[PDB]
Every structure is written in C-alpha cells, then in structure tokens.
Design an enzyme around this catalytic site. Structure first.
Site, PDB file in Angstrom:
ATOM      1  CB  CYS A  90      42.979  33.856  42.420  1.00  0.00           C
ATOM      2  SG  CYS A  90      42.170  35.483  41.397  1.00  0.00           S
TER       3      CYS A  90
HETATM    4  O1  LIG Z   1      37.431  35.469  42.238  1.00  0.00           O
HETATM    5  S1  LIG Z   1      36.546  36.341  42.723  1.00  0.00           S
HETATM    6  O2  LIG Z   1      37.157  37.341  43.528  1.00  0.00           O
HETATM    7  O3  LIG Z   1      36.096  37.479  41.560  1.00  0.00           O
END
Ligand SMILES: O=S([O-])[O-]
Ligand SMILES: [Cs+]
Ligand SMILES: [Cs+]
Ligand SMILES: [Cs+]
Ligand SMILES: [Cs+]
Ligand SMILES: [Cs+]
Ligand SMILES: [Cs+]
Ligand SMILES: [Cs+]
Ligand SMILES: [Cs+]
Ligand SMILES: [Cs+]
Ligand SMILES: [Cs+]
Length: 138
Positions: free
Chosen positions: A10
């Site tokens: 992420c």
């Molecule tokens: O990576 S998404 O949760 O925005």
C-alpha cells in the site's frame, strides 16, 4: 516508541513508514494482515483514533464486498468482529506514538503525532511534495 500497522503493498502505508523514519525513529512494524490486533487492542485503537468503527473499514476488498458491508445493517461490534476475522478489512496504516493514534490516510496525517520534526524535505513516492527542506508543509 512508535508502532505502525503496515501493509507493504500500500503506497499510503509505505509513505507513512518513511515519514516516521524521516523523523529519526524506526518504529515497531506490525504486519496486521498476518498479525492483526486482538479485540481489546482493536477497540482501543479505534477509540484513540477518534473515528467511527465503520470509518476504519476498507472498502473494495473481497470480505467487504461479499459480506455486504456497504449496507447499513451492522452494529459497531459486528463490524469489529468482522475486522478481526478478516484483517484485510482494517484500513491502513494505523500509527501509535506517545502523542496519539491516527489512521494515517492521507499519509501526512502522521505528522500530527510524530514528536520530532522531519529531518529534511519529504516527497511521497509518486513525487508529491509534503514538507520542504526548511520543514514547511506545502
Ligand atoms: O488502496 S485503497 O484502499 O484506496
Ligand atoms: Cs517501538
Ligand atoms: Cs529518535
Ligand atoms: Cs495481537
Ligand atoms: Cs481494489
Ligand atoms: Cs480473500
Ligand atoms: Cs480468497
Ligand atoms: Cs449485499
Ligand atoms: Cs507534531
Ligand atoms: Cs528540517
Ligand atoms: Cs498515489
């Protein structure tokens, strides 16, 4: 004494971790997908973060979709127990410092709870400038 609930996949989480480091501290890193908080801890994190339980839920992941969590048919504790049983529902990153706890979305929220100033300019991995060399937010 800093803890980050981190998802290396992420970019928000990567940027947050690097801003932590740029304040001169290496945090304890918890890979929440593997090692989620306990119920008690999760309940505490949410209280400290001052957001709602539902506001911590990540949308657009398989359990959110299949369990129908978009619909307003779940109590806060139902939602807590789904997060514990399906950790990818816990949005990220959560950061704990001696100053407080935040869901660091966007990543620069973490500046609020880092005790020490950024040691130099910080630019997100996509090139978005966050603070300049002199330490001013852009
Ligand atoms: O990576 S998404 O949760 O925005
Ligand atoms: Cs620590
Ligand atoms: Cs330090
Ligand atoms: Cs745990
Ligand atoms: Cs997605
Ligand atoms: Cs899955
Ligand atoms: Cs799956
Ligand atoms: Cs549904
Ligand atoms: Cs601060
Ligand atoms: Cs600085
Ligand atoms: Cs991005």
């Amino acid at each position: 004494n800093i803890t980050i609930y981190h998802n290396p996949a992420c970019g928000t989480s990567r940027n947050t971790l690097e801003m932590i480091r740029n304040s001169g501290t290496e945090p304890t890193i918890i890979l929440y997908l593997e090692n989620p908080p306990s119920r008690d801890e999760l309940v505490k994190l949410i209280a400290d973060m001052g957001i709602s339980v539902r506001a911590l839920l990540r949308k657009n992941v398989e359990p959110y979709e299949q369990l129908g969590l978009a619909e307003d048919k779940f109590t806060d504790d139902q939602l807590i127990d789904f997060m514990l049983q399906h950790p990818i529902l816990i949005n990220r990153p959560i950061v704990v410092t001696p100053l407080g706890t935040r869901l660091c979305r966007p990543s620069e929220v973490v500046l609020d709870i880092l005790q020490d100033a950024q040691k130099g300019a910080f630019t997100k991995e996509d090139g978005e400038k966050v603070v300049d060399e002199a330490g001013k937010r852009l």
